[PDB]
Amino acid sequence: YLRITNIVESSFFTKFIIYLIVLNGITMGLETSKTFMQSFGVYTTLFNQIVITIFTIEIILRIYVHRISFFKDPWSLFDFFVVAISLVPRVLRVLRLFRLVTAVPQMRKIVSALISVIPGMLSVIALMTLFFYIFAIMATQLFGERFPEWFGTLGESFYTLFQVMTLESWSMGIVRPLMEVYPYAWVFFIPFIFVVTFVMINLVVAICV
Amino acid sequence: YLRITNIVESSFFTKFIIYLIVLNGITMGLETSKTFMQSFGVYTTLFNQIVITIFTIEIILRIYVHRISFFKDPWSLFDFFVVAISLVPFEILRVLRVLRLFRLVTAVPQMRKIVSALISVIPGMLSVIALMTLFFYIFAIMATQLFGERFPEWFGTLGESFYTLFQVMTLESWSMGIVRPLMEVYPYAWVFFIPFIFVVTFVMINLVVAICVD
Amino acid sequence: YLRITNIVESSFFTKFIIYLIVLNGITMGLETSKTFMQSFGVYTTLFNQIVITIFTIEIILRIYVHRISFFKDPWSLFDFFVVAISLVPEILRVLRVLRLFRLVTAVPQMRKIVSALISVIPGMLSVIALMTLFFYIFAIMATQLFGERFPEWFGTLGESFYTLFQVMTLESWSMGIVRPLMEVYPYAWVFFIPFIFVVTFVMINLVVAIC
Amino acid sequence: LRITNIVESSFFTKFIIYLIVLNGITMGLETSKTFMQSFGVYTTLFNQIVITIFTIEIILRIYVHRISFFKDPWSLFDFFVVAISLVPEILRVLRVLRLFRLVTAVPQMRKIVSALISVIPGMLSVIALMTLFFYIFAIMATQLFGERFPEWFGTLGESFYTLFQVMTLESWSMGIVRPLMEVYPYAWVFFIPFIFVVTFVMINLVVAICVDA
Numbered sequence: 001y002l003r004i005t006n007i008v009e010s011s012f013f014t015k016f017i018i019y020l021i022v023l024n025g026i027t028m029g030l031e032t033s034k035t036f037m038q039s040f041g042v043y044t045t046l047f048n049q050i051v052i053t054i055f056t057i058e059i060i061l062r063i064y065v066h067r068i069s070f071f072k073d074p075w076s077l078f079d080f081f082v083v084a085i086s087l088v089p090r091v092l093r094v095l096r097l098f099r100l101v102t103a104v105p106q107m108r109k110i111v112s113a114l115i116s117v118i119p120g121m122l123s124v125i126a127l128m129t130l131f132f133y134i135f136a137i138m139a140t141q142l143f144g145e146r147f148p149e150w151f152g153t154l155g156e157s158f159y160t161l162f163q164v165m166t167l168e169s170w171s172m173g174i175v176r177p178l179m180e181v182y183p184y185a186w187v188f189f190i191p192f193i194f195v196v197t198f199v200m201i202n203l204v205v206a207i208c209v
Numbered sequence: 210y211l212r213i214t215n216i217v218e219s220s221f222f223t224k225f226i227i228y229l230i231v232l233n234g235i236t237m238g239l240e241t242s243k244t245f246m247q248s249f250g251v252y253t254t255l256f257n258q259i260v261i262t263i264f265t266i267e268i269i270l271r272i273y274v275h276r277i278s279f280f281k282d283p284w285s286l287f288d289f290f291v292v293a294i295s296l297v298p299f300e301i302l303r304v305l306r307v308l309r310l311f312r313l314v315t316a317v318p319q320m321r322k323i324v325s326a327l328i329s330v331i332p333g334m335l336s337v338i339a340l341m342t343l344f345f346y347i348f349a350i351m352a353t354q355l356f357g358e359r360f361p362e363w364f365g366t367l368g369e370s371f372y373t374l375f376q377v378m379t380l381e382s383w384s385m386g387i388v389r390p391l392m393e394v395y396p397y398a399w400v401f402f403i404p405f406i407f408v409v410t411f412v413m414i415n416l417v418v419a420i421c422v423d
Numbered sequence: 424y425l426r427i428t429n430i431v432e433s434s435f436f437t438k439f440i441i442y443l444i445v446l447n448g449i450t451m452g453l454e455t456s457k458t459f460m461q462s463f464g465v466y467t468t469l470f471n472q473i474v475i476t477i478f479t480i481e482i483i484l485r486i487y488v489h490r491i492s493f494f495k496d497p498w499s500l501f502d503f504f505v506v507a508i509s510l511v512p513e514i515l516r517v518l519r520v521l522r523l524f525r526l527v528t529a530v531p532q533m534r535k536i537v538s539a540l541i542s543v544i545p546g547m548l549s550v551i552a553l554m555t556l557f558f559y560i561f562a563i564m565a566t567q568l569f570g571e572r573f574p575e576w577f578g579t580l581g582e583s584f585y586t587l588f589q590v591m592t593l594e595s596w597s598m599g600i601v602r603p604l605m606e607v608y609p610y611a612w613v614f615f616i617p618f619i620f621v622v623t624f625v626m627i628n629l630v631v632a633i634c
Numbered sequence: 635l636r637i638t639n640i641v642e643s644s645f646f647t648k649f650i651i652y653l654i655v656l657n658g659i660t661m662g663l664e665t666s667k668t669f670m671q672s673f674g675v676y677t678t679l680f681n682q683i684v685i686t687i688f689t690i691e692i693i694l695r696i697y698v699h700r701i702s703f704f705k706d707p708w709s710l711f712d713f714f715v716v717a718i719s720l721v722p723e724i725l726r727v728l729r730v731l732r733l734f735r736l737v738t739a740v741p742q743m744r745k746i747v748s749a750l751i752s753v754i755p756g757m758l759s760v761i762a763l764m765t766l767f768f769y770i771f772a773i774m775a776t777q778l779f780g781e782r783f784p785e786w787f788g789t790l791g792e793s794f795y796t797l798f799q800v801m802t803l804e805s806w807s808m809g810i811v812r813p814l815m816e817v818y819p820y821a822w823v824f825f826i827p828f829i830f831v832v833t834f835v836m837i838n839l840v841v842a843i844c845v846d847a
């Protein structure tokens with residue numbers, strides 16, 4: 001019993017996993033090259049199953065070693081799903097290259113120390129969706145009639161507005177043609193770009209605290 | 210009188226306000242989809258009048274409870290106007306009725322703080338912003354009598370001189386979209402525009418720092 | 424001397440100058456509309472001439488009242504030159520609109536704002552000079568690398584400058600410049616991608632240096 | 635020991651800066667084709683003198699400094715930029731890097747460099763995350779959109795450039811993401827979150843930089 005617990009939390013075992021991680025990453029970085037998957041595709045498709053096989057064992061062990069304690073450690077928890085994904089018979093399997101974040105304790109803090117920023121802002125983030133929701137409704141029934149590729153859908157109003165938010169081709173690509181049919185659209189968007197922009201500065205400042 | 214005053218400042222009423230918001234939001238969030246408004250549009254268009262009816266009441270009561278204190282409290286004040294817009298049957302207002310889904314910010318005491326904590330920046334910046342508009346005004350005049358003769362779509366009007374210059378501020382398509390064609394007729398437009406990008410940029414950065422300190 | 428000295432330093436006079444500024448400002452904002460200058464050009468073309476006369480007088484008084492003390496006050500200095508520009512009887516005809524900046528000078532609330540931001544400039548001259556050489560070294564490389572086939576972008580050292588600043592600003596840097604370049608010189612992702620890195624990394628750290 | 639006194643003189647320190655600015659300015663006309671027509675031969679020789687003379691300073695300082703020399707970064711760097719210049723057209727272009735040595739002689743710049751380079755270590759925990767994050771994502775696209783959009787995502791390396799471009803937000807939507815949505819209408823599930831994480835990272839870098847120095 002306790003004999004197994006010593007194998008898991010050993011430096012050897014953990015270090016061994018991280019080696020396979022770095023390796024299986026390189027394996028997926030050659031599954032891209034058509035030339036490679038031609039000559040060595042057979043070599044790889046099995047080699048991957050070996051890895052996800054070993055990772056199945058470890059995650060099973062990690063469960064028996066931790067029992068109910070396991071499904072409260074996110075990194076440990078997260079690792080579980082990412083293999084289940086890898087189990088299901090194709091692109092989302094590459095998420096298992098995130099365990100290199102989990103398996104390395106130097107990263108876990110960085111992720112957490114940056115997710116620690118998320119809560120002090122959800123009061124702001126939640127506001128935006130409401131702000132976006134009303135506007136996406138306005139546009140889709142304002143400009144949605146003549147510019148449907150941009151505003152034909154409520155959701156389509158989202159993508160264009162978040163783009164205009166990012167300031168990519170907001171003027172030449174969206175606002176200028178809009179102003180050829182609705183010449184006052186410069187009253188809709190110029191403030192919206194200000195309103196949304198004002199948020200970002202005060203956030204950055206609020207976080208430097 | 211005071212009997213209603215207990216209903217008004219009840220948590221139910223406070224909680225209730227936030228409820229109707231969410232429904233009319235979702236209801237207006239289906240007033241967008243053409244598909245929905247076919248079978249249930251009339252049922253919906255009336256539901257808004259139902260909504261816009263009830264919303265008349267709250268602001269009526271809340272005023273008598275607050276009297277002159279009401280028309281000095283911003284959050285409550287705002288609440289009123291959004292109904293008058295919603296009250297008017299120039300369709301635009303029928304579209305502008307959708308602002309009534311903004312009141313969910315007012316009723317939530319967690320939100321007002323969020324809003325308030327950001328407006329405190331304007332006074333430490335109103336000294337700057339007013340400078341910016343003046344800066345634009347002097348410059349917007351320069352272009353309109355410089356490039357306005359051959360580029361009327363971009364600089365033909367002062368208002369168009371504004372829009373084009375305010376765009377270059379954002380750096381969106383400023384070079385290939387604006388300055389490069391300018392340099393085909395007036396090869397020095399980079400003397401107008403390259404510095405203008407500096408000052409305008411330094412202001413906004415120096416503004417952020419002024420906010421970073423406070 | 425002392426007889427005039429009471430007119431100069433009055434609050435009234437200060438208030439009076441700012442009136443013509445705001446007046447000449449809004450007045451200068453309609454000299455753009457072609458329609459007006461036909462029906463009202465004489466009213467306007469002269470009103471400018473009226474003002475620039477008065478400001479010539481004031482600047483004469485302000486000089487004699489302060490004498491050598493005048494030519495050490497920045498705000499005072501600028502105001503003078505902007506009238507000299509305005510004095511010359513077609514580029515300058517546009518540069519006359521700079522006289523709408525004196526509203527910054529006459530208002531003591533502005534002078535602080537401008538200066539307190541020019542007060543940041545010295546703490547950055549150590550940084551800025553590095554970039555120019557960095558910019559200068561690179562413009563030489565491109566102009567003799569890609570300048571042969573891309574003359575609109577890199578035919579001249581100065582043209583390499585404009586492209587680099589433009590690339591530095593991130594406007595159409597990739598699709599407009601780097602992508603077509605990589606169709607003839609497939610390694611242009613080695614020239615510019617670092618230039619985007621170094622230049623960008625500086626600006627963040629600079630704001631931080633000021634923050 | 636006779637030469638050693640010349641090197642660390644204030645004259646000599648200043649003296650290097652003379653040839654830099656001159657060779658810098660001289661290369662600013664080796665660039666202009668117009669000048670190099672009438673003065674090219676006049677120009678081509680001045681460089682060889684400099685690239686010869688510039689060898690000496692780094693030669694002397696080494697015997698003066700010995701093993702102390704190859705532990706001072708600025709001292710180290712100075713050599714390679716000359717060694718590059720020595721090898722007899724990319725190299726002929728890379729010779730112009732020799733105008734960087736002006737950084738060595740001037741102590742006012744190094745402080746900015748050092749005081750800024752200092753904020754690069756406390757973040758490598760973040761940057762390496764980004765490279766991995768890009769790596770996972772660059773793989774996803776390249777086998778997602780690589781089939782129909784190869785100039786943008788046909789190769790992992792091409793996914794890099796396209797993703798690093800979208801990071802800067804240059805023509806990411808109209809130029810890259812919007813056409814993607816005509817065949818794969820779900821590319822906004824790949825790209826919209828990717829836009830969030832990468833952006834949030836850059837902010838957090840700032841926070842780390844705000845605090846550090």
Ligand SMILES: O=C(NC[C@H]1CCCCN1)c1cc(OCC(F)(F)F)ccc1OCC(F)(F)F
Nearest residue numbers: 166167379380592593594623801802803833836
């Ligand atoms: O703002 C950004 N671009 C818009 C501005 C900048 C100038 C061009 C157009 N205007 C921006 C740029 C970034 O480049 C990161 C680097 F690639 F350098 F690493 C990262 C995050 C950004 O922020 C996005 C936000 F905040 F706008 F949403």
